[model samples]
Target: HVKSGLQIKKNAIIDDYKVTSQVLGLGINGKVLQIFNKRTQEKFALKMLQDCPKARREVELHWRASQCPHIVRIVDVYENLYAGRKCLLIVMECLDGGELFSRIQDRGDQAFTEREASEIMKSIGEAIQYLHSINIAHRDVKPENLLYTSKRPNAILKLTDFGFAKETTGEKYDKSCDMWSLGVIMYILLCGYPPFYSNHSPGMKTRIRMGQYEFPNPEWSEVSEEVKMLIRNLLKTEPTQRMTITEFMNHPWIMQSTKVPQTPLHTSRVLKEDKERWEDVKEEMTSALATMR
Candidate 1:
C-alpha cells in the first residue's frame, strides 16, 4: 500500500481476472465491463482508461475515498499496455442490483413511500459527506451512478462512476455543486421526472442557471413542508447559499428516516410514465456536464 493507503497492484490485469467485452456501463472518460476474479470467481466491474495524468488522478481520488460504505470499493488497479498503448484497469466490486430508480420501479406491489426516499437520500448523503471530508467532489451524482449491492430488498445503495470526480485540494470551485445534484436527485425521488426538463428546447441553460423549477400540483401537494424545504435549500442558485452536506446529513427527515411519515409517492408511476423522456433528459445532462468540466 502507498502512503495514501491505496493498494495499487503492479501486475498484468489479465493474469488475475477474466475480462469480457460485455459493457456494464459507460463513464465520462471510459466504459466499464464485466469481469470475474480468477481466485474468488466473484463477478466484478472493470473500468479501462488510457493511462494519463487525468486518469491517474481519477483513480487516486476514487481509491482514497472508497473507504466509505456508501461509495463503491476499488479492489485493485493495474497499469498495463493494452491495444498498443498504456492503460489503467480499475477493478471494483460489482453492484448487481442495478440503477437507483430502476430498483424503485421494481418495487411494483409495494408503494414507494416518503420514508423510503428519505432513507435513500441519507445513503447518498453519506457518500457526499465522505467525499467532501476528503476534499473530493463527485461532480456527477445522477440516478444512473447510484447502484445497489444486490437485487434483494435490503440491498445497500452505493455511489459509483468516479470519472467526473474532482479533487479540491487547494482552490474552491463550488463544492456545493454536489449538493445541487443531491437536490435534483431528491426532487426526482419525490416525483418521477427531473426538475429541469428542457431537453431539445432552448433556454434550458438559462433556466438551470436561474434555478427555475416547479413542484407541479399532484406531486408537490403530498410532499411534506420539511422535505420541500430541504430540497429548496439544496437547489439554491448561489453555490454558497446551498445547503452543506453536514446540514443535509443532520436534517430530521434524513437522520430519522424511520420517523419520517410513510406517505405514498407517485415516483414510480411518473417514472414509468415518462420512461422514454427520461433517456432524453439523461442525454441533456451528459451534454451539460461536458460544459461544466
Candidate 2:
C-alpha cells in the first residue's frame, strides 16, 4: 500500500480470487463482478475490460493513482484471458454503500441536509483536486461514480472510474466540465430534481448552456442565499467563469462545511413524489449529454 508502480500479473486471476457470476456493477469501459480473495476470502469487486491500448493506459494511470483516499483504490490488477480473449481484470475494494444518487432517496423520507451536501461536495471536490493536481482529470464525474466505502454512517465517499478518462492531454480537456456536473449534482442533493428539468434538449440544454435555472419554491425556502450563490458560481455559462478546484476548496461552503446549515432537505420528498418524472428525465438525459459533452 505504501509504494509501487503498475504490476500486471500474467497469472490467471481465478487462482488468486474466487470469481463468481454475481455482477456488482458496471463502469464506462466494462462490467464488475463480485469476487473474493482466495485465501483471506475478503470480498472485492472485479472490474473486467477487454484488452486494448486505451484500456491498458487506464490501468497504468489508475494504479499510479491508488493512494488518494478520496479515490477508489485499485486493490489488484491482472492480465488474464477470459473466454480465450485477453482481458484487463482489476480488483477493486468493495463499496457496499452504493451510488450516491440511489442512497439519497432510499436513506430516509426526510433525511438530507445542507451541511451533508457541503460535506459530500467537499469529498468529491477533493477527488477532482487530486486528479487535477496530477495533471489528469475524471472526464465523467457523476453521482453514479461517487460511491462510498461502506454502508456505515461514517463511511468514506470515493470518486471512481478511469474508463471514462479520455484525457491523455489535459490542455484539450476543459476541466471545468467537472464543475458544471458538480453543480447539477449539488442541486439535486439540495432539491431532489436537477436545476433544469426539461426533457426536451433544445429548451433544456439551452437553459443549461445559458445557466438558466432556479431553486424553486419550498425547496429553496430554507436553503441559504450563500449556498445558492455557490451553486450559481459553479453553473456559470462560460466554463472559465466557474469555480476552479482551488477556488472551490477555498470557498467557505466547502472548507467550513461543518458550519453549514443542517436543515432537512426536500430531496427525498420530491424524488418520491415525482419518481415517474425523474424516470423520464433519466431516459431523456442521454440527449441531455449531447449538450454536456
Candidate 3:
C-alpha cells in the first residue's frame, strides 16, 4: 500500500516497497517514516524532505556522503507524494542505532566502553582524514550529528548529518576545519559539553566561524598530556595553527593507540567523575518542590 505521507506515483516506484505503520521520528523539517522491502523484514530510514531548503541540502549531502565508508549510506532516492506535496524520499540504512547525544548522556551506561571509545576514535580519525584528504570540510561536528549502527562495543559510530558539510579545493579550504571537528568530537567523548560555551546561537556560529574556541590542558587534566596537546592543537583558535590530518594522524595522541596504555580507559572515567562532582543546584532545588504533593 502507498504510505500515508506519500502518494503512489506511477514512475516513482523504483522498487516494490510497502510502508508500515511504524514512524520513527518527526522533526520540524520532515518525518522519518519506517518502511520495509517487499520480501525483507528489514527497514529503511525513509526521510521525506518536507521543507524545500532542507530537502535540497540533504540531497547534495547524500551525494557527498554516498561514497564514504564511515558515512551513512544513502540507499536510494526518489520523489514521493506526502500530504499531497511532492517531497524527496531518501532511502537510507535504518542505522536505527540512534544519535550519539543520548548514548553519551547515559553517563557511560550506553556510552562507549574503553575498547569502544578507542575504536571509535580511530574510525572517526580515519574518516575525517579521508574527508579532508578529499577536500571536503565538515563545518559542523557534534555528538548529535554522529550516528551509530548498534549498541556500544558492537556499535559503529559514523559521522552522519552532512547538511553543513562543504567541499572545497586549494583556496576554498584547508584541513583546519576538519581538524576542528575532530577536536570537538574528542572533547565531547571526554567531557559531556563542548569546550566552549556560547551565550546564543549566533554566538556559537560566530565562535566556530571565527575560530574562537580552543582546548586547554587544564580542561582535560585527566587525559594524557599527549592527547591534550593534540586536542589543543586541533582546537586552536587560529585555523592556521591547527594541524592537518596528515600531521594529526602521526601525532602522539593518535599514535597512543598502539602503546596500549595500562590506564587508557581511566581517562573517560576520570573525566566523568570530575564532571559529576559538580552539583546541579538549580535542578536539585527544583526537584524537591516538584516532588511535593
Candidate 4:
C-alpha cells in the first residue's frame, strides 16, 4: 500500500501505484489532481493544497465529507512535495461522469424524463437530508458540486465538494441554502436556464442582491405544481421564508405526486462555459457578501 504523506514524484510508483495523470480542477483553496494505483488498476482524485491556510482546513473538511457515504467519500489524505512545495493530497472517488451542469448544457432542449429527473432529485435530496441530519450545511449546492458516478448506468448523482460547506444547527443553516441551490438546479434542469438570469447588463446580480429574483413567465406551467412550489420555497431570498431540508425532502415535488405544473415552453441558456460561469458567480458572491460586511 502507498504510504500516506509520501511525496508525489512525476511517474513515481507509490506502493505499486503508478502516478499516471494529473487532475487539474481548481477549488477555492486548492486543485484536484489524479493518480492511478497500478496494483488495483483504480484511479483516485487527489486534492492538492500547496498553501498553509487551505491545508489546515482541508483535513477538517475532507474528514467531515468522508464520514458519510452518501456524500462524496474522501478515500485518502497525505502530505506530498509537488513542484518543490509542500502540498496536501486528498484521494477520493474518481468520477468518470462530468459535472451535472455540463450534461444539462449538452442536452439543450430535451426535457429530462420524469423518472430520470425524479431519481436524480431524490439522490441529491437524500444526500442533503443526511447532511442536515448531522448538522452540516452545504453552503453551496450548485450543479458543479453534484457529480455523476459512472459506476451506475443512469446518471447517478454523487454530491461532491465540501470546501464552502459548514457545520451548523437546524436553527442556523436550516437548509435554506440547499433549497435555494436546489431550486436553481431544478430550474436549469427544467428550462435550461436559471430562474434568476436576465439578459440586461447587471440584471441578475442586482436582483440577487435585492432578493428580487423570480421565475420567468409561466416557466413552471408544464412542470409539476409541487415542483413549482418547491422552487418558490427554496428560492425565497429570506431564509425564514425558505423551506428546510426536511420539508424539502418531504415536499410534493420530491415526494410521490402527479400534478405537473406549467413552465416556459422553450429551453433558454446563457452562452458561457461551466468554469467561466462559476468563476463569475464566485466573484459576484464575494462582492455581494463584502457589501453586507
Candidate 5:
C-alpha cells in the first residue's frame, strides 16, 4: 500500500507483543526497544514516538520505503495512549547482525578488503536508489543507520531510521543530500576516518561546506583511483553537481562488484588504532548534522 493508504492499528502493542525495556538502539527521534510477537515468539525492534504531525510523517515515510530489500522492514505500527499522552509505537524486523562499521570492527582475524567495501557500498547505494525513486530523501544516512539482518557473514546490509527522512520533490533539500552521505560513508570505509575532520562543530561544517578533503598517505595510498574518484564526485560541495543515486548505482565499481579487486585494506588496522578516538568522531558528527539540517 502507498504511505497514505497504510493504517496505524489502534490496538495496544503490548497485547500482541511482549514489550521489554531492553534498549536495542537509539534512533534520531527516540530509543528502540526489544519486543517479541506473542504468537510467533519472533523478536522485533520497537520505537516509540510521542504522537504528533512530525511523528506521523516519520512513520509514513518509513513505512513507504520499508518494502525495499536494502531497507529495514516495518512489521507493524500501533497508535495508543501512553502515560496520558498519545504515542506511536513502531515494530521493525530485528537486525541481529549489528551496525555496519561495528561488524567490520569485529572482523579481527579476517581481512576487510576493497572488494568487500565495494559490495557494502553497493548495498547501501541500492537503498538510496529505492528511497530516491519514491521521491524520498534519507537525510540521516550515516553508519549508525546501516545495519545487517543477521550475524551470518553473508547477511544483507539494510538501511534504517527515518527521523530525518522527507519527501524530496519540491522540497528545499533533495536526494543529493543522500549521495553526500554515501560519499562520507565510503570515505570512512576506505580510511577509517571521515574526510571532514574538526574538533569543533562549526569548523567541521565549514570544511564540509568547502568540500576540500584529500586522500592522505598510509591509509589512502593503497585505495584504488576508481573508488577515490567516486568519493570525489559524491562529496562535491555543490548539491547539483553531486552524483545522483542512479549514477552511483551505475558506476562500474558498484555495478561490477564481482570484478572489483580484493586488495587488503588499511581500514581494520586504522579502525583498531586509536579506537577510543572513533567514539569522539561519531559524537562530533552527531552535533555536526544538527548544523547541516
Candidate 6:
C-alpha cells in the first residue's frame, strides 16, 4: 500500500538515527555525517541536503541507479526539521575506505602496471556501463566521487556522489561527457597525471578544444600504443567519435585484448613525488579544472 515516490520518513529522524557531530565528508549540496542506527547499532552514512526539488531529483536518480553492485546502495531516506529548516536526509552504506585517488596515492611503487590500470578501469567502466544502460547519465564521474567498501586491499569499490546525475532520454544530452571523464581518469591511472594540465599556451580552453596533448617519455614509454590510441578515441575533439559505454566495454584493452601488459608503471612515483609538491600540483589542477563549466 505504500508505493510512495520517495520513502522519506516524515517522522523525527533522531529517534532512529543517533546522529553524531563528526563530519565524514562534504557532498555537493551539503556535508555528510557519521551516523549509527539506533535499532541495531550499525554504522551508515547520512548526507544532508536542504529540501528542494533539486534534492528530490538527486535522491530519485540515486535510488534508481543504486541497484548496481558497483554503485553505492541507498539504505533509507528521511525528511525532517533540523535547526528549524527542513532538509533531506539520506542513509546509505558507509564507504570507510577513501577516495580513489587517495587510495592510489597512498600506495607504494610496487609493480603498478598497464594491466593493473586495465583491471581498475574495467571495474569503473562497469559502473558507467550500468548507468548508461539504465539511461541515467552520471555527469560527475570523477575519482573523488568513487568510494571503497572498506579500507582493506580487496575491498569493494563503488561509484557515489550523484550530485550531477540526470535521466537521459531522459536527455538534455551529455552522455559523451561521462565517456570523456572515463578517458581522463584512465589516463591518470596509467600515468599518475591528466590528459590536459590546463596549461597557459593557446589558453587552457583552446588546447582542450583542440585536444592537444602528448604522451611524454619515461612515464609513457612502456604503455602500449593500442592503449594510447584508445585514449585518443575517448578524448576525441568530436564528442560523437568518443567511445560509448558499450564500445568502451567491448574494446580489446577493456576486454583483455591480447594479454594486457603487466609492464610496470610510474604512477605511484609520479603521484608520490615529494609529497609537498605533488599535493600542491594535484590540488591546483583539479581546482583549476573545476572553474570550467
lDDT, candidate 4, at 144: 61
Taking the tens digit of each residue's C-alpha lDDT, what string does model 2 give over 1-293?
35767888999887898864334224324666678898998999888888899989887777766788998889888888766678888899888898886777777655888899889999888988887777676667766678888888788999888865645355444577777778878888898887764525322212232344487767788988888998998888776577777888899999999998798898877676665565655555435544665
State the lDDT of candidate 3 residue by residue for 1-293, as single tens digits: 22122232334533556763234235225556667777676777776665477666656755655557777777666665555566666777766678764555445543433334445677788777767766777665555557888775467777766665666675654456667767766765664445553333321222222345344343344556666677788777777677777887776556566553433333344335434422332233224223320
Tell me, by TM-score, which candidate is best. 5
lDDT string for model 4 (133-211, tens) is 7677766676567777773447467888766666676557445667777766766666545554433343232223234
Candidates, ranked, TM-score = 5, 1, 2, 6, 4, 3
Q: What would the per-residue lDDT of candidate 5 be over residues 74-151, giving only the tens digit for each residue?
A: 899989776667888889998889889887776777367888989999999998898888898888888788989999
Higher-lDDT candidate among 1 and 5? 5
Global Cα RMSD, each model: 4.2, 4.1, 10.1, 6.0, 4.2, 4.6
Best by lDDT: 5
Tens-digit per-residue lDDT, 74-144, candidate 6: 99998887666787889999999997767777876444778878887888899899888879888877767
**Clash number by candidate, in order:** 0, 0, 2, 15, 0, 2
Q: For each candidate, what TM-score against the reference?
A: 0.88, 0.86, 0.70, 0.73, 0.88, 0.85
- List, residue by residue over 1-293, the lDDT tens digit for candidate 1: 45466666768877899874344224314656778999999998888888898988889889988889999999999887766777788889889898999977666763688988899999999999989987999898887899899999899999988878887862475467788889888988888777774524442222232334477767778887777889999888777577889899988989999898888898887777666576876776666556553
lDDT of each: 0.80, 0.76, 0.58, 0.60, 0.81, 0.76
Off by over 4 Å in 2: 1-3, 20-29, 168-173, 197-213, 279-293
Q: What lDDT score is found at residue 192 in candidate 3?
A: 44
The list of candidate 4 runs beyond 4 A from truth reads 1-13, 20-31, 51-54, 67-69, 151-153, 197-213, 257-293
- In candidate 3 the C-alpha lDDT for residue 156 amounts to 73
Q: lDDT score, residue 112, model 2? A: 84
Model 5 CA deviation exceeding 4 Å by range? 1-4, 20-29, 170-173, 199-213
Error at 201, model 1, angstroms: 9.6
User: How many Å off is the CA of 54 in candidate 5?
Assistant: 0.6
Positional deviation of 282 in candidate 3, in angstroms? 19
